[PDB]
Each structure stands twice: as C-alpha cells, then as structure tokens.
Design an enzyme around this catalytic site. Structure first.
Site, PDB file in Angstrom:
ATOM      1  N   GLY A 234       0.637  -1.382   0.169  1.00  0.00           N
ATOM      2  CA  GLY A 234       0.064  -0.157  -0.205  1.00  0.00           C
ATOM      3  C   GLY A 234       0.836   1.105  -0.124  1.00  0.00           C
ATOM      4  N   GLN A 235       2.195   1.243  -0.050  1.00  0.00           N
ATOM      5  CA  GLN A 235       2.795   2.619   0.182  1.00  0.00           C
ATOM      6  C   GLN A 235       2.823   2.961  -1.519  1.00  0.00           C
ATOM      7  N   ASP A 236       3.046   4.390  -1.546  1.00  0.00           N
ATOM      8  CA  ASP A 236       2.661   5.161  -2.621  1.00  0.00           C
ATOM      9  C   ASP A 236       3.137   4.519  -3.990  1.00  0.00           C
TER      10      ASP A 236
ATOM     11  N   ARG B 133       0.875   1.585  -4.714  1.00  0.00           N
ATOM     12  CA  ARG B 133      -0.289   1.887  -4.754  1.00  0.00           C
ATOM     13  C   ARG B 133      -0.466   2.100  -6.307  1.00  0.00           C
TER      14      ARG B 133
END
Lengths: 159, 91
Positions: free
Chosen positions: A53-55, A58
């Site tokens: 889920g980190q950018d 993502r």
C-alpha cells in the site's frame, strides 16, 4: 476464487494474509511488491493477491485488477487522519472497469485498539452505502486474533 | 511468430495462463512483433502482472527486454509515473 487485497500501507494486509495461511501472526516488513498465496476455506481455494500500500506500489495495483472476482479493502480503524485518503483511493477503484462486477469486502481492522473507529463509522466515512452496482459488505476484524477473518471469507464465498 | 501483425488477442490469452512457459512465449511473441514494428499496447496489464517482483530471472529478463525498445509508447498497464511498472518492483 480470485481475490485482490489492497488498502493503505500499515492497514494490516499481510498480517491478514499470513494469519489466514499459517494460522500465525508474523513480523511483517512493508510490502514493496505483492504477496500471493492460496488459502483453503470450506471447499473454496482463494488466491489472494496482497499488494503493498505505500505510494510507489499503490500506483501499480491496476495491473492486478483484471480477473479479480473479489476485492478485500483493508482499513486501519485506528488511523483517522488517513480515512479520507482511503475513501479517495477506494472510490476511484470502484470506477475501474476491470473491477466492475467484483465483490467488495471492507475489513475495518485493528478493531482491537481502544480508539478504533467502529465499522459503522467507517462505513459512513468510506461512503459504502452509496454502492448500488455490486455486492459489498463491511466486517470488523482483528488480524492478530483472527477475529472477523473467516466471516469475511464466508461472505466472499457467497458472492 | 516471424512477423504477424494481428495476433494481439491471442497473446493476451497466452500471457497469463497459469503456465510460466506460455507467459514467456507470449511476452517473446510481443517482442518479435514490435521489433519488426507491429501492434503491442493492448496487452500491457496482462504482460506486467505475473513478472513484477520476482527474482525468477527469465520472465523478468523478458520484461526488462521490452523496456528499451517501446516503454514510452505502451501505456494500458503502465500509464505515466515516476516509479512506473518498468521500475517500482524492479528496485
């Protein structure tokens, strides 16, 4: 059954997956990538794609959209600052054509923490009531205890 | 596939199939049609999805191959970002 599990970083996605696969609570590192695993529940074999889920990551989920029968969206119920951001990510995810008919299961997670928002609160903040085009469900979970996890697999299997 | 410019629908099918050989062959077939100069963006999400993190070199090498000859043009499965699907899990 093919499952895509996403959510912001630190929501508990990998903890959930390996609790389900190993009955164990592992010591996670941030997932730069995915984990993919197969889990047996009641005659269904769920192939779960846990995508970090980190950018940077993502930005990559869209490659895992296609062929997805169901979507697990994990939320950290204790993090109130990022709930809007979760709402924003999830809303445009709902607009994705490859995700068009996929079953939508929200896990409001870390329910074990004293100030965790309730599932009802989360339902209001994520705008879940406004989904009329497909199946949705929200489930309070604690991935460390295992609470709500199989209730999730149950709901999902009834797509 | 020496040069066959309409075959992109079959390649998408072949690109993910649960059989690693088929995926490699597919991605290979894409490379040979681009090098000659033929149609390739339809496939992109499929292409990108199996290979990304893995240390398993052959698919990774194949995807790595396709990023020096057309990365810029193809955008279905990549789009435009700083840490594209060319390099995000290729760290």
């Amino acid at each position: 059954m093919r499952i895509l599990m996403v959510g912001l970083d630190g929501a508990g996605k990998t903890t959930v997956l390996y609790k389900l696969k190993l009955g164990e609570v592992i010591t996670t590192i941030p997932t730069i990538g995915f984990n993919v695993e197969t889990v047996q529940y009641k005659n269904i074999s769920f192939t779960v794609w846990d995508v970090g889920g980190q950018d940077r990551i993502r930005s990559l989920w869209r490659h895992y959209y296609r062929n997805t029968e169901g979507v697990i969206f994990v939320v950290d119920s204790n993090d109130r600052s990022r709930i809007g951001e979760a709402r924003e990510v999830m809303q445009r995810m709902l607009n994705e054509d490859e995700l068009r008919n996929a079953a939508w299961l929200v896990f409001a997670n870390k329910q074990d923490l004293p100030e965790a928002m309730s599932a009802a609160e989360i339902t209001e903040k994520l705008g879940l009531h406004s989904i009329r085009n497909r199946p949705w469900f929200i489930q309070a979970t604690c991935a460390t205890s295992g609470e709500g996890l199989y209730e999730g697999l149950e709901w999902l299997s009834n797509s | 596939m020496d040069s066959e410019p309409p075959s992109e629908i079959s390649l998408k099918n072949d690109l993910e199939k649960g059989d690693v050989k088929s995926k490699t062959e597919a991605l290979k077939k894409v490379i040979i049609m681009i090098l000659n100069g033929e149609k390739l963006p339809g496939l992109l999400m499929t292409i990108i999805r199996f290979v990304l993190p893995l240390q398993d070199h052959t698919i990774k090498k194949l995807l790595l191959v396709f990023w020096e000859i057309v990365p810029k043009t193809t955008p279905d499965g990549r789009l435009l970002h700083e840490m594209i699907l060319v390099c995000d899990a290729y760290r």
